[PDB]
Design a protein around this ligand. Structure first.
Ligand SMILES: CCCCCCCCCCCCCCCCO
Ligand SMILES: [Fe+2]
Ligand SMILES: [Fe+2]
Length: 221
């Protein structure tokens, strides 16, 4: 029942959170575009994709006659967003890449795919389209970081350590509203640990290293 006051209420926060992610992602990729001149056009492309996602999700909100609680969503993203900004200012492209392209993208992939089977038919269509783009964004980050892994390794570990716990906290924060929308926490935690562990394996981390990196997240709750 997409019309109930309890579905509308949870949707107000989830829709707003998703919209903030897409909008925030737009700025992250534009900022990366400055920091990685060799990848400037490509990163600009990924930015414009995020813009379209934002519009797509604003339209999912209107379809269910829900005003997004943007204030709640700004606060949801705040810590992780300020960490990205500070990294950009420091010239730390690797940290900015791991945040947005790996931690974050992955997060949207796991949650979005879980949302698809329980989503109203308008939003299901919008979401199927956005998730397709997300695979690309994650692949871009994996490809760059695997190509530059030795130079990048130590900063990735450090960035993972500061930022993965922020995503776990975001995960806990959304859990109850997500359930109302028909999305189980257990699937979301699992699909995220899997997606991010595989991304870490794919760029070059060992079993012990992935366990260490993953554990910084799981331990924060
Ligand atoms: C209406 C969308 C339903 C899915 C909501 C997922 C719950 C919280 C995850 C939000 C993650 C936002 C990340 C967007 C980043 C874009 O590249
Ligand atoms: Fe996106
Ligand atoms: Fe994205």
């Amino acid at each position: 029942d997409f019309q109930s006051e309890s579905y509308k209420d949870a949707y107000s926060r989830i829709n707003a959170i998703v919209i903030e992610g897409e909008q925030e992602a737009f700025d992250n990729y534009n900022r990366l575009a400055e920091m990685l001149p060799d990848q400037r056009d490509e990163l600009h492309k990924l930015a414009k994709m995020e813009q379209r996602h934002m519009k797509g999700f604003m339209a999912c909100g209107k379809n269910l006659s829900v005003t997004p609680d943007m204030g709640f969503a700004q606060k949801f993203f705040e810590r992780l967003h300020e960490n990205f900004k500070a990294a950009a200012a420091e010239g730390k492209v690797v940290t900015c890449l791991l945040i947005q392209s790996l931690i974050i993208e992955c997060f949207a992939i796991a949650a979005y795919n879980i949302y698809i089977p329980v989503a109203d038919a308008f939003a299901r269509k919008i979401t199927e389209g956005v998730v397709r783009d997300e695979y690309l964004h994650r692949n871009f980050g994996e490809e760059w970081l695997k190509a530059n892994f030795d130079a990048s390794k130590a900063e990735l570990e450090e960035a993972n350590r500061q930022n993965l716990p922020l995503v776990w906290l975001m995960l806990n924060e959304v859990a109850d509203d997500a359930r109302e929308l028909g999305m189980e926490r257990e699937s979301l935690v699992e699909d995220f640990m899997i997606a991010y562990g595989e991304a870490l394996e794919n760029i070059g981390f060992t079993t012990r290293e992935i366990m260490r990196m993953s554990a910084y997240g799981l331990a924060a709750v």
